[PDB]
A paper describes a structure:
Actinobacterial [name] reversibly catalyzes the thiamine diphosphate-dependent cleavage of 2-hydroxyisobutyryl-CoA to formyl-CoA and acetone. pmc2-Hydroxyacyl-CoA lyase (HACL) enzymes belong to the thiamine diphosphate ([name])-dependent decarboxylase superfamily and catalyze the reversible cleavage of 2-hydroxyacyl-CoA thioesters to the corresponding carbonyl compound and formyl-CoA. [name] is the first published HACL crystal structure and forms a compact tetrameric assembly such as the OXC and ALS proteins. Interestingly, a unique feature of the actinobacterial [name] is a large C-terminal lid domain that, together with active site residues L127 and I492, restricts substrate size to ≤C5 2-hydroxyacyl residues.
Author numbering:
A (entry chain B), C (entry chain B): 16 to 587
B (entry chain A): 15 to 588
């Protein structure tokens, strides 16, 4: 070891921790680190808006399991990340944001961009610190990295900033400890056999067990989950954050039976999943028959809203496998599961077939379902959807996408936070992580306007993305809530903008589609010329399931009207 | 068959159902609705003279019993009087619940009586700090906060809940009162991964001088799996103030008078439920120059701080210790380093303990405080069983003398890593009410005692059989010493020759003064037979504790003590 | 100038800012400052509990107008001040708390007493900072001092901490600027003549104008206030924080007519006073006839709860004088004022006379009013109450004191915060500020137990205080609310403690009184042998006005039942 500046040690820490790319937007306050990363051969993915850098890191970590890194300058560089940080905090995604900040001598004197970054981010981070001791910077980075995994909290974003004078200070070689530089393995807490046995007992007693998966299940490869489904005879639901773990053809996979599974299950088993608004707060109003069991590697997925008759705090894979083993010699009763599955096959197959022929709305424009029809028709022709990363974003478009996207290797979307604008940044992070296939993002026009200039970033860094815009000249789920519940549409219309032209202005391939029969051809050309955008002129006369269920209205007790009605009855 | 009842009734029931049989507090209007309901269910109310003392009593209760304890305080100054005791619990990572009063929702921000931002003041030193504005969700919020106090979504420590008085009085329909939120919950038991267990056993097989240092998380076990691992590993053993009492004094590993020698030479430091904070030299290579590091804990607050393990086990510590012991089944440890320390320890500790009975008066003619520990040792097996006694220490010099003078105790409590002066009397009261059969003896500096002296009243009114012994040296003496030695000017560190026995008698406790060291055993004997009691010992200012000699008072740049700091300064210049 | 350590410059800053005493409790982290203060001859008033030091500083500033200073060590030294800081923040009293904290190199490493002091205090301070730049420490002190006066906020407490390594760092002489060292005058914003004229117009139109005073009025000597009372014919009420500004014999002074003034005034003029719970939130329910005008040097006494038809933001003295001048040639209609005054003379005189002969309660013990009777009887004999600083504290005792203490040079009490325990610390700060007269504090036994050991501090520093304890073996306003509203008394009884014995154990003169006829003699002996305590064995059978009006109950909308009833009617 030799005496080297803090900036050098930070670049080395990152590379040794397995960071081969940093997302960011340059400023003077972070230039010392930016320079050292480039000199070590860490790829710098520079963006048009720092928020997008943090979104890219989110997508990288969620897909790969490797903690990802954004770097931004002081002041507006940091404040531009708050949305993307909050989004990662809600989704419990490990990531590190490195911020610039003013030299220590000028503290509180009104130097350029002295604002309280750590106080702004503290509520939505696992850690937010200013590092004022050159010798301790390495230690602070390693500890923050561990806290991003969930140590002393739960998985999510961490923020570190180093005053520019400290970045330039040398650290003597004695104080540069290998144990802080090196990569660390993930923790693997194991289940207690008595909890495993108690869950197996509940499964044996249940007639309609159901497993709902989430983030923590999606950190596994799905095989231990499938073992437990086979051993238990449980029905299976996933969530936006846990798609892709169980084959569609599995006798448990009943994705078109969400309401029926929740209404009738007598044993809800959550696997790395919150009982947040997406699952009716786990309310007895939404699960009127269910006993509850919770399995997770974080109490953020054990204690919220409902408590388990058993709760297992362990690596979910190990817990699923242990419970499967414990059900050695059990003959599951699968008759409810099988009855749902027979209905599911009809419902899901009729729905997927109908995507190819959805009528234009009353305004003469494409129904957005035809986008998902066209993608389905191209499967096995010009792309393999089973190898493809799919992304959805928007309001009505997002709700249609949840039903229209049925084969994907991986799925990302606006998340429980409802974070519009993720589509393009996510696509870029996904595409640079998995350079072999195009990544396909389908987005509302409203959501796309937030991050459209990142098309430039995809072109400059050669991220092979296809963006498909549902261009309905509107914030349409908003416009619909305005008409139905208020009788006045105001400030929710957009214009017939040329998003293909925006894409072409930033060097991407672009095409506009007004005729639904042109979709397959346009998506074929976009895939062969990624990065590319397909601007689809879509109808305003198409209510998504989210629209129909009052998501826009914000009821008192539940996100959706039917759940809220059930909660009002429970409360009497 | 549940009925519609007020939030205040549901809170009292939640607490009782979670195993709460006592609440420490001080009444105010904002919390009276809960206070009343606790009394009507038969939960004992231990009312104090200062809310901070209530939170100290809860801390002592949880630390000793493992049962999360509860303090209840009114809005405004009731809540703000808890901040020190909350911070203390936060540093020590002790689960506890503080329930605060606060103004009715309609008056928010309007200058109602005692509207201050309690949650913002406490957020930095709690695992959770919330105002509960939805009557039907109060039970849920209590149960989740209780789990966060155990360490869920954070690490063990204090949580804060406050319920606006209008919410306390609102009815909750019976369908919304869920059994799953009312019922007591078992502690979590994450288990070790066998590959980590194997990797630690491999490091132990390869070490020549393994050493285990225990802390809080070890002290949550009964010590028997720790002993199994000591036996299988041949490791030397050190404890810390927060982990006394787990290993028999005569165990071949127990080498408490060889602290420097263990740290200087160990080639494998194993932390068990212990932080590498200032009390262990930040785990610095300057203080552990030969050590590989392994960390075992049920919380990463005792795995990632300052040093990283070659292996880190995140599990219930008992299970991890037992697993590693099993893995060493056929290992024959090399115990020659441990045994050589142990032989020197036996003599050093025995000579130290013997000399306590005869320590000379200082140049000012007053008792050396070590004679307090001599007297207690002399009474062991006569009028008290030290092995069954909860010992407490507090102060500056007195506390440092206590760390060597208190060697036999069932359990030990003190000022903590936070250096929280004034814990002695509140801790003794919580300890005595938890263990009413048992001797409870607290030894304190005069300076520390003045912070919570009026709690003697609480001990008398609630019949807490405590003995407080005051090292009355008319000074904040570790401070006075640092002033003289490093600054050449003693100012604002002298106190007076106060009659602390008279203070105790004024509050209906037994009290006696001792000026002659030969009177100490008799005065402590009379105090034990007449508890609650105070013994006011007139002690010397001419007596430097180890803490005093090592520069604790000076606050060096890198380490709490001069010798460690010198070692760190050398490390920084390689 | 020469190169000197930060610790030296801090001691010099304080002395040059007019600080001749610092209240505190020693620790290693602040020893460098403590030492330098002593070497410059600043008196160190060392206490038994840091909270008491901050209370002492509060009392000094409230009485003298000089910003006062407490100094405490890291960790529990700082956390022991939070109550006294909150109290000063509620009362808007300028003061500076200097805290110790760990050296910068050990930040976040678990050094001794590293807790987030600034985050704990930020919500109840005008400023809370860690000072990490030796050269900028002086500047930070001067700016914080200004913010304690109300610059960039409103008057109140500020907190500064200096890491011990920074305290020991030298500052070159160039960077030690005279402008930061020197004392600064208070600000004196002036009224706008059009606002002055608009208030005079409202007074001319009013038939029952009333002035209520507060903190900002009490920063004046009362003479401009009396000029405006004379010019306006207004009735006058003060509050606990504004006693002593208007002679008792003034035709406006109607202190026994509080309810009548609020019910019937058609023009409420607040002068440096909040419309907080102490004035019924200024609700139309409590002031049903009143137009509102607000005068203050801080918007903290202009915008809360009621807005003025006119609001004057100015030095209150100047504003009162300007409005008096503007009422040149007005003949006030004083008939309502005079009618209140005639009733007030009877009510207040009967009340004061009855204090001398109040019967023992049913339990055979002294009614606490006899304490105020005895003090009244000694006036002009062994003390001059008109030159005496009176302090009250407790529950029932505090409410009796508000009526029983009618002549004092100055009055302090538990404040709008209801801060039990202030009595002894306040008495000590008052006595060291005004060494010529004994200071008299009357306290409940409950409140006294919080700070009783400060009797030691009064003895060691020779603060000539007399403490009189209403020893009713109870938190009695609490016990009464328990009996009346709940039918169960539990955890509100105390014991028949020997507080005289506690005082004597700390070297003070002490005496116990069981016979009300012994009060004058005991108080005479206490005054001649201060510091002294008189332990009065008092009745539990005595409801204070606060007790009778439901203060203990905490109604939904107002602090007191009758105000709350009026608010409930207003809300229908
Ligand atoms: C750090 C990084 C890169 O990551 C960032 O985030 S930078 C953020 C984006 N940039 C900014 O926000 C700008 C920040 N800096 C400034 O605001 C300015 O540099 C300053 C206020 C600190 C200094 O500005 P000046 O006081 O130098 O003002 P200017 O108006 O820029 O004048 C420059 C020169 O032109 C002169 N000048 C002005 N008007 C002129 C005129 N009309 N004709 C000729 N000369 C003219 C002026 O006198 C002066 O010359 P001199 O007297 O120093 O030689
Ligand atoms: C409030 C506002 C407007 O300002 C916002 O900010 S909104 C923010 C942007 N939007 C979001 O972030 C979305 C938030 N909402 C949601 O995530 C969802 O509404 C929910 C998670 C709360 C509830 O979703 P569901 O549990 O209904 O799940 P979906 O996958 O949407 O399925 C809807 C229906 O289609 C069904 N379905 C699923 N896949 C199918 C398939 N392949 N074929 C046929 N039907 C299928 C499914 O069973 C169900 O029907 P049913 O069982 O209720 O009858
Ligand atoms: C800064 C200020 C003044 O403002 C404050 O606020 S201070 C706050 C109040 N004080 C505290 O909270 C104490 C803080 N400090 C400590 O906790 C300790 O100094 C330390 C943890 C940092 C260091 O303690 P040690 O590791 O030195 O442990 P001790 O138990 O005190 O042992 C001291 C010595 O006695 C030895 N010893 C222990 N038990 C013995 C026995 N039974 N017989 C003989 N010797 C014995 C022990 O080995 C050692 O000698 P050596 O090996 O260094 O020579
Ligand atoms: C909630 C709990 C118990 O947990 C707490 O924490 S309480 C905290 C400790 N207590 C406090 O901090 C006190 C808080 N409350 C108050 O400050 C007062 O209740 C108040 C400011 C809200 C209202 O006080 P008032 O405006 O009633 O003022 P007082 O000076 O108390 O006067 C009471 C009555 O005596 C009258 N009075 C005043 N001086 C008199 C005199 N000299 N002779 C005769 N009568 C006199 C006065 O006019 C009035 O009678 P009326 O006009 O209403 O009929
Ligand atoms: C940053 C932000 N601001 C507003 C909103 C609120 C919202 C959620 S969905 C929606 C309409 C989306 O319009 P889009 O054109 O993308 O989709 P479509 O319905 O198919 O026309 C809005 C305004 C959110 N969640 N995020
Ligand atoms: C609340 C608080 N304020 C100050 C301090 C700083 C301190 C730590 S030790 C000490 C002196 C203790 O004097 P004592 O009389 O108890 O013991 P002895 O040395 O034997 O005479 C001080 C002032 C701490 N830690 N906490
Ligand atoms: C730190 C704090 N904790 C509790 C309370 C709540 C309270 C306000 S008044 C009172 C009773 C006071 O008893 P005392 O004996 O002093 O007076 P008396 O009624 O005449 O017997 C309590 C408990 C407050 N405000 N502050
Ligand atoms: Mg933005
Ligand atoms: Mg749209
Ligand atoms: Mg002492
Ligand atoms: Mg206190
Ligand atoms: Mg009382």
């Amino acid at each position: 070891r030799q005496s080297v500046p803090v900036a050098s040690l930070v670049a080395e820490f990152l590379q040794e921790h397995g960071v081969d790319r940093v997302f960011g937007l340059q400023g003077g306050h972070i230039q010392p680190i930016w320079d050292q990363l480039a000199r070590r051969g860490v790829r710098i993915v520079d963006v048009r808006d720092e928020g997008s850098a943090v979104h890219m890191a989110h997508a990288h970590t969620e897909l790969t399991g490797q903690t990802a890194v954004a770097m931004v300058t002081a002041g507006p560089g940091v404040t531009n990340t708050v949305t993307a940080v909050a989004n990662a905090s809600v989704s419990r995604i490990p990531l590190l944001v490195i911020g610039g900040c003013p030299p220590i001598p000028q503290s509180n004197m009104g130097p350029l961009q002295d604002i309280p970054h750590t106080a702004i981010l503290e509520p939505i981070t696992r850690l937010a610190r200013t590092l004022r001791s050159a010798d301790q910077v390495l230690r602070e980075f390693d500890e923050a990295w561990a806290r991003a995994s969930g140590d002393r909290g739960e998985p999510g974003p961490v923020y570190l900033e180093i005053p520019t004078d400290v970045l330039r200070r040398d650290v003597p070689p004695a104080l540069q400890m290998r144990e802080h530089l090196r990569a660390k393995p993930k923790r693997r807490p194991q289940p207690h056999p008595d909890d495993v046995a108690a869950v197996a007992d509940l499964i044996r007693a249940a007639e309609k067990p159901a497993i709902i998966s989430g983030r923590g299940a999606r950190t596994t490869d799905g095989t231990d989950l499938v073992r437990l489904l086979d051993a238990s005879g449980a029905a299976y639901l996933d969530t936006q954050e846990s798609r892709g773990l169980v084959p569609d053809s599995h006798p448990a996979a009943v994705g078109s039976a969400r309401s029926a599974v929740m209404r009738d299950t007598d044993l809800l088993i959550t696997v790395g999943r919150q009982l947040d608004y997406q699952l009716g707060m786990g309310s007895p109003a939404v699960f009127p028959h269910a006993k509850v069991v919770r399995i997770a590697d974080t109490a953020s997925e054990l204690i919220d809203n409902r408590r388990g008759e058993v709760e297992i705090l362990a690596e979910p894979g190990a817990a699923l496998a242990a419970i499967a083993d414990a059900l050695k010699d059990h003959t599951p009763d699968t008759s409810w599961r099988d009855e749902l599955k027979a209905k599911h096959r009809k419902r899901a197959e009729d729905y997927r077939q109908a995507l190819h022929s959805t009528e234009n709305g009353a305004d003469g424009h494409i129904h957005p379902n035809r986008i998902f029809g066209a993608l389905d028709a191209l499967d096995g022709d010009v792309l393999d959807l089973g190898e493809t990363i799919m992304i959805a974003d928007g309001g009505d478009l997002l709700s249609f996408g949840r039903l229209g996207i049925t084969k994907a290797r991986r799925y990302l979307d606006a998340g429980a936070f409802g974070c519009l604008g993720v589509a393009t940044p996510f696509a870029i992070g996904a595409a640079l992580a998995y350079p072999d296939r195009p990544v396909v993002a389908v987005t509302g026009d409203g959501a796309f306007g937030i991050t459209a200039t990142e098309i430039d970033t995809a072109v400059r860094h050669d991220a092979k993305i296809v963006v498909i815009v549902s261009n309905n000249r509107a914030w349409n789920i908003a416009r619909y809530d305005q008409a139905e519940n208020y009788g006045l549409v105001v400030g929710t219309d957009l214009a017939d903008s040329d998003y293909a032209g925006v894409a072409r202005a930033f060097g991407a391939h672009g095409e506009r589609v007004t005729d639904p029969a042109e979709l397959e051809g346009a998506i074929r050309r976009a895939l062969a010329n990624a990065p590319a955008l397909v601007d689809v002129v879509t109808t305003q006369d198409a209510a998504s399931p989210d629209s129909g269920k009052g998501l826009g209205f914000v009821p008192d007790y539940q996100a959706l009207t039917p759940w809220n009605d059930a909660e009002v009855a429970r409360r009497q």
